[PDB]
Each structure stands twice: as C-alpha cells, then as structure tokens.
Symmetry: D2
Subunit: 257 residues, 4 copies
C-alpha cells in the first residue's frame, strides 16, 4: 500500500479491461490515479468505487481533450509521475484485402498517435518528477497475428517508439517502458469472440495458445505496470512480456514440399 505512495498516475482507457486493472493496481500501491476514458460508464463507477481515483472524460485522439487531461491532473493534484498509455482497440479479424488505408489511419490515430500526444504533453511534468511512461503494446507487434495487419503494425510502432523515446529522455531521468500483453480476458476479448461462428471454440483456442493454458488477467498487467513505475529504476526501453508463454515453442500455425 506504499510502493507508490504520494505519486500521481494517469491511465488512459482506464474504464474497463486492462486499464481498469492497472488503475486498481496503482490505487492499491498508494498512488492517486486519474482515469481517462472516452466513455463515461465504467470510469465514473470506478471513481465512485475507489478512493484515490478520479475520472476525466477524454478521447486520446482529440488533442484538446488530452491537453485538458494534463492541465486538470496538474491543477487537481500538483504533480504527474506516471502515464500509462493503455487506450487502444483491436478491430474484428480482417483479411489484408478487406482493410483500407483510411481504416489503417484511424487505428493509427488511436493506438499510436494518442499515445504519442499524451506522452508529449506529459513529458515536461514527468521531467520535473523524474517520472516514467508505460505504454501498453502487444505481443503480436513482435510475433505477428493473423487477420490483423493494421493492428499489428500499430503495436510494432508503439514498441519501437518506446525504445526511441527511452533513448531521448534518458538524460533527463525519465524512463520509458512498455508492456506487451498476450491474450488477456477483457471485454474486448469477449466482444471479438462473440462475433465469431463458434465463440466458445474461439475462447478455448485463446486459452490454449498459452503454455499456462489460460488467458491473463487485467490485475496481472496492472502488477507489471506498478513494478515498472515503482521498482524498475534501471529499466528503460524494455518490452515486458505478459503473455503466459504464448511466444514459446512450436504450435499449430497452418513433407518438405
């Protein structure tokens, strides 16, 4: 309850799923948390539930929303120590020929440029506090995924951007790291599975993609985020895998012709 006491954290997309798990983990570590989300429902309830968390409506694709998010965080709490760029989306499975450049641009706006924009506006305050940035990327940025060309590209960009910014901000004492989750059971996972012919079979395949035989939990991503913020003082530019071992070994991906 004291690992991150006295610190102020902003979590984007904090109203449900991984983001809400990260919010809870930081509150449990003693921090004050600003929950950013484009939707009011989950985040407002979380603000009522958790002493030490407050909700600010903010769409990270809207630069003026993000400017207000940062200025209100500083006005209300007087410092900013950690930004967790969690807001993002995975579209339904799409074959490459079914994608469009305009859909790709829109997904880049959320998954990549929203992370870029908040980070940029927050960095002057993170420099003052020797704070840190945590980006939520994805394992599939590293290893690929089927029927997800735009999504995979956006997460490869987030992971690479994390390393570039880590280099640039290292002289100023600001660490920049990312977490790459694998299959985490969240409302997005449940929504995507419900679109499939056999949702239950899709969910079973998702569980068995991990050597551990289950999906991950938001709380497990949250613990990884609290570690990076509060105890990983010699880590910058890392990609922390929270995947249950999905990237390990041979599997079903499809004699020598």
């Amino acid at each position: 309850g004291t690992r991150y006491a006295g610190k102020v954290v902003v979590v984007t997309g904090g109203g449900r799923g991984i983001g809400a798990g990260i919010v809870r983990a930081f509150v449990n570590s003693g921090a004050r948390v600003v929950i950013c989300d484009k939707d009011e429902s989950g985040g407002r309830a979380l603000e009522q539930e958790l002493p030490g968390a407050v909700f600010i409506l903010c769409d990270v694709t809207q630069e003026d929303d993000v400017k207000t998010l940062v200025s209100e965080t500083i006005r209300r709490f007087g410092r900013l120590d950690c930004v967790v760029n969690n807001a993002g989306h995975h579209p339904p499975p799409q074959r490459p020929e079914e994608t469009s450049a305009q859909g790709f641009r829109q997904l880049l706006e959320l998954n990549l440029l929203g992370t870029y924009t908040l980070t940029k506006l927050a960095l002057p305050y993170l420099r003052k506090s020797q704070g840190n940035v945590i980006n939520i990327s994805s394992l599939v940025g590293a290893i690929g995924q089927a029927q997800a060309v735009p999504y995979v590209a956006t997460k490869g960009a987030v992971t690479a951007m994390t390393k570039a910014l880590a280099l640039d901000e290292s002289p100023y004492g600001v660490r920049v790291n990312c977490i790459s989750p694998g299959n985490i059971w969240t409302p997005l996972w449940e929504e995507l599975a419900a679109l499939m012919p056999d949702p239950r079979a899709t969910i079973r395949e998702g569980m068995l993609a991990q050597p551990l035989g289950r999906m991950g939990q938001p709380a497990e991503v949250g613990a990884a985020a609290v570690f990076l913020a509060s105890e990983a003082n010699f880590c910058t530019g890392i990609e922390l895998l929270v995947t249950g071992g999905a990237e390990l070994g041979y599997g079903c991906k499809a004699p020598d012709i």
Copy 2:
C-alpha cells in the same frame, strides 16, 4: 545472371541510394525491373543505363499513382513476381518535443502506408505468380535511435506488418520478408550528415557504429533482396539484418548512481 530470369520486379524509391542498388542487383540476376520514384532525375537515367529496367514516375503516397504503377507493370510485362518497398525518408534529427503529430502522420504516409498500398494492389498478381514482398525497414525499428521518434515508430510498424502479412499470405504461397539495414552510405546519409555541425565527425561516428568499421553499400542490400526473392523459399516473415554488426555488444550510449 539467371537466378531470377523471367521474373518481373517493382522497386519503389529506385532512383538512387539503396533502391538503385536493389534495381541493379535484380537486373544482374536476369529480372526485368520497374523503377518507381517520385523524382525523375535518377530513375530516368537508370532506365537509359540498364537494359531490362524501365522508369515509371510514381509517388507511393498517391493511391492513383500506385494503381497506375501496378496496371502499367502488368500491361507492359505480363506478370509481377516481387515488390520491393524501399521508398522512405529519415527526417533530420528531431528532439521529441520538436516533433508534431502532423509531421508524424506525414512520415507514416510515406514509410508505412505507401508500403501498405503498393503491397495491397500487387498481391492479386503476386498470388498468381507465387511471388513475394520485400519491405525495407531499418535496424532502428528494432533497437531504437536517438532524435527520431517518428521515424523509429514507422519502421517498427513496417517490420511488424511484414510478419502479420506473412501469416495472412502463407496459405496462398506468397512470402513476405523484410530487410533491416543499418548505416548504409546513400545520398540521404550524406544529406543528413551535411546538416550537422561537423559533418565529417558525424560520418566517422556512423562508420564506427559498426564492428566492421565501415558503412554498408546499396549493392549489399541489393544482394540480400535478390536472395530473399530468388533463393529463400522457406523464409517468410523474417527480418534480415544488413547492419555490419551494429546491434552487437556494448558501446557509447550516454558508479551505480
């Protein structure tokens, strides 16, 4: 002179630098090559110089230019076997706070979406020929670079997109690979160095960033591209490093406090 005989290759940004080296390597392997570039000067001369290469003016950020590039390649040569997505740019060094979302969008349009667009329009023809895609990414997508947040992000996206598309096109027999060059001596390298306070010192630092103690040549990237196209039939989704060992070992990147 026969490793890729009878095949038809499109090289974007083929008028100078790495692209021209790739053009030359494919012509030397027996292929017919379409040189795409937004600038006429280098590519037109290359078409006069090389029997088997022709020049088509085409800005890869302009979807209708790219549509015409593909339709003219098919009209003139009757097949398409390999697309090399080489067109790209590295801006001058820029501190993160000096970047803009709009500059970032513009660089994504070239380095990422131009590659996406040509690949999409070419894939129906590559399926017919069991052809392949070669994207020119960058080592710094993998390891980061200072003062280059947008550039690094675009190359992380290209490398990840390569793996996603490799998965999607594997059932159709179309391989998708990338080359990640390190420091290659090209007109872009020379132009960026000339902007620096001490261009000669910048160039010396660039040479010594490699264990091999020199920069790479366009011809060396070209040989790697010809290998991927013509002889790497069990390679898909790989990132072929052509970096002189820059990613190896400890170096100068900046007692325990």
Copy 3:
C-alpha cells in the same frame, strides 16, 4: 514486507554482489531465504545480519553439495517456493585464440550446469508449492560481448534453457523466468576493472554504455527477482532486461569500404 510472506527462497551465490542484493530483497518481502555460496565470508555475515536468512555452504558445481542444499532447506523450513540461480563467473577478457576447450567446460560447469542441477533437484518441491525458478543470465547472451566467447555462450544457454524448461513445467504450474542484467556494480565488476591498464577509464566506459549513464545496483536486480516470484503469475519463459538501456541505439562498436 508481505508480498512474499510465508515463502522459502534459495539464492545461489548469495554472499555478495547481485546475489546478496536478491537475498536482501526477498527478506524485505517477508520470505525466508537460504543463502548458498561456495565462500563462507560474505554469506555467514549476511546470515548474522538478516533475520530470516540462513547460510548453507554449497558449491553448485558439486552435485552432492546441491543435494544437501535442497534436503537441508526442506528439513529446516518445510517447503521451497523459489530458486534463484545467481552463482556464476565472468573470466577476465580473453581473445578467442587464448581460450581453451577445458576452460570453456569449466565455465559451463558453473554458469550452466550448476543452474541445471539445482533446478532439477528443486523441481519436485517447486511443483508441490506451485513455486518458480529465476535464472540470472546476462544481456550479453543476447547481444554478445567482446573478448568473452565462453561466457557469452554460457549465458545464451541459460536464457534458452529457461524457455525450454518454462514449456516443460507449465502444465505443472511452475514458472521459469530469467533476468538478464547489464552492467551491475558488484565486486566482480570491480575485480575485473582492477585488472585493466586504466581501471578508472574501464569503469567510466562501463557507466556510459547505458543511456542512463550509470551502472545498475544489486538491489535493482533484487526488485526484479521479487516481482518475478511474487507478482508475475502470467509470466513464464521471459527474459527480464535490467540493463539501463544498454541494448538500445547506436554506439561505439569499432565510408562504405
């Protein structure tokens, strides 16, 4: 003080350096710790200093020493939750032609087979407790190091072995992870630097190999180990980098000929 309460941890090479930092971190988390070392001096003092830590003399290259280490841990504390395989050595810099197969075998015995042997003897007890294995590898297993062919090979083996065992033990609920430190200021670092022509210059080069501009501390590796043991329940087979960003960007490793 409660994150790992009630748990029992064995740390090899725990008498000084990173190992002692790991011992301290686990004691501070509420665990009981068995300090294994081949030398009595540091570990015996640490046992007097820390309530909750005890010292067992044990050379991890001697199978019967390791058998007794495990049986005494169980006899004295009734369970085993975590094994930290930290014992290892880095020889002085050696050019490849100055190495020997017999020196290579000896270093494999310590850095690789000692880790293998303790893990094997501990796994029946870790299965009962759903415990975990933490191996201390090295960044240079991943990126290489000059004048260290045998050492680098042993750490590449440890990191790979970690992933293999993670796969094998996943059905039994036992996680297997590794930490790859970069330059950590330890008595070994100080001893190796003292052998060099200009020890102070060697130490300065070591600090500047990190974007953060300093070396790491044993306490920072220890915090990473406590995270992996106590809060990383969806992590198995990962390589957690604790390197200060040394693997990022271009540096001094040595125009196109």
Copy 4:
C-alpha cells in the same frame, strides 16, 4: 556456378541431411568442399558423386581429428575460406527429470564445443583469406522447445557464441554468422518421428507448425549458407531464420484462471 568460385569450404556433418544439402549448394556455387563426418557411408558416396567435393573422416568431438581436418584441407587445397559447423544431434524427447548432467555434457561436446574447436583451429586461415564462419544453430534456441532442455541450451549457446566471435573477429575482416533452421526434413527428423507412438501424426504436426504448411529442405538451408558466405559482406553476427514462419503468430501451446 561462379558465386563462390576458387573458394574452399569445410562442412561438418556433411554426409547426410542439412550438411549434405549445404555441401551440394557450395559445389554448385563453384567451391571446393571438404565433407567432414564421423560416419563414412554418406560422405564417401557424396565424394564419388560430386566433382569438387572430398571426404575426410573426422569426429568433431575429437580435437586431434579436427586438427587433422584443418591441416589436410590446407595441404590438399592451399586455402580455407568458409567453415560450416553443421554437425550436431537432437536426442529423443526427454522430460527434464529424465535428463542427466552427463548426457547434457555429452551433447554440449558435440553441438557446442565441436563448433568451437573447428572454428578456433580454422580462424588463422580464415583471417588470411578474409573468410567466414557459418554455424547451424536452431530456431528452438531462440523460442524454446518441449522435452529438449539440453538441446535447446546447446543451440542458445551456439547463437550467442556466434555474436561474441563476430565481435572479436570483426577487426580482422572475418564474418561469423549463424543459420537457425526450423523443421527441416532430414534423416534425423525421420528417425525421431519413428520413435513416437504415431510417427505419421508427429510428421503432420511438424509440417503444420509452419505457416507455409510444409517442412524445409536441406537445399534451402544450403542456399542460405551460400548467401552468407558469398554475398553477405555487411552481415556479421546475424541469425538467419530458415523456419517457414514457425516463430510467427499464435498456435497450440497447451478463461483467465
């Protein structure tokens, strides 16, 4: 037929499987090849079949055999340009608790130290010719494999050793690279499958572990080796994946508990 004309290549384990494919590829490129193998049957026949290849009986675990291999290569052909360290073995699947330290030592002797020993004895001659080293590692050194702790560890060591030696030999102009094959259809693959309850099912699983839906061929590893030797002059310390995409995407490796 001229890419590697006038050059002299040693291939260990060249009598069958991948090694024989590499021998054939180098002969087809114009090189003279010394086939090293511990067994006479395949290699002697290959020497009769291929003008430009000769067979030398040599067990790479026996230092005096390897000394004679190098001295006879120089005596008979007057130079040495490339060493391909292909000899190696994969034991039958073994659960971790079924392995032994002594079995692990024996596999290290072949897969790791045999590569080390030939490389060491060859390097004085490779320096004179600005030649290169190609080690045959494995994809599973990078991603792990089930029931193969010793094997995986040996290949992680080979890949890491490749990078270390690349650093050390870069000032002398000698490149050191590795190839990491995935599932390649070889007599070893066929022998291991025949040990399983349902060999045909094991082979089908092996094919489907690749997005390409087949296993690789020795000839495909051979083409990769010829590329590294003859045309990859700015590549050193790389790991060239010849895996059919097995490392890409999610698969079958085994809702959030």
